[PDB]
Amino acid sequence: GMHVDIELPLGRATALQRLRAQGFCVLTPAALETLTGMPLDAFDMMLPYWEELAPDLHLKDGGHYRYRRHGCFMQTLQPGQLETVQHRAHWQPTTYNALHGGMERWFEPLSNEMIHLPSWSALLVALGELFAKLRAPQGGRWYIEAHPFRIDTEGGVGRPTPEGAHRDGVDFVAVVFIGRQGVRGGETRVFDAAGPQGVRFTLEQPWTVLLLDDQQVIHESTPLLPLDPADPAVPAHRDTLVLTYRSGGFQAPA
Ligand SMILES: [Cl-]
Secondary structure, eight states: OOOOOOSSOOOOOHHHHHHHHHHHEEHHHHEEEEEETTOOOHHHHTTTGGGSSSOSSSSSOOOOOEEBBBBEEEEOOOOOOOOEEOOOOOEEOTTTTTTSSSEEEEOOOOHHHTTTTTHHHHHHHHHHHHHHHHHGGGGGGGEEEEEEEEEESSOOOOOOOOOOOOSSSSEEEEEEEEEESEEEOEEEEEEESSSEEEEEEESSSSSSSEEEEEETEEEOOEEEEETTTTTTTOOOOEEEEEEESSSSOOOOOO
């Protein structure tokens, strides 16, 4: 099988061995603290922004209601720096073989206050430094997109993704579990992209992080189901943060 390190904290060197060997690993909240040098209280400062995400009104597929925001960055590895870049669209071609065309989506920008938190930079930088140890990006630069999400069961019906498991068309992905209430389901699955092996596990502790080598694994999560569907007024949602890292540039039409 494959290792789901969801109970014990991985150090950076073990996390690297895991990503090389199986193409993903899980960092417990304690492992994230150790990796980033930031205590969990500093990460908690980000939580109120998940109450202010913008509705994503682009799809009308009868799925659960989606809220999000979007922001992009460039990380330089030596000398280390992280900087914002101008707000930009997110590309969604029907295939990562696409050179041109496809859908470009404008979302609302991340809160400026959130991106100036110490934990925000600590998070993006530490993960970039880790990922560059597996596969160094061209010119020592990562192009990073951040997608904070809330999926709310107050409306819509959750169904399996038509496409099944996906990759993101980048080099590395981090899925950070931010929180959840009033729901079950939302189980993550990670599969070997070139073999039959897979794992299932449910992220439950805030600041648990799933690290993915986007060229070696594919992933998905199962639909949410309200714990108390009989009662509307009880909040029922799941919060995540998806960070993508890409060499060369942001995914974009030529
Ligand atoms: Cl690609």
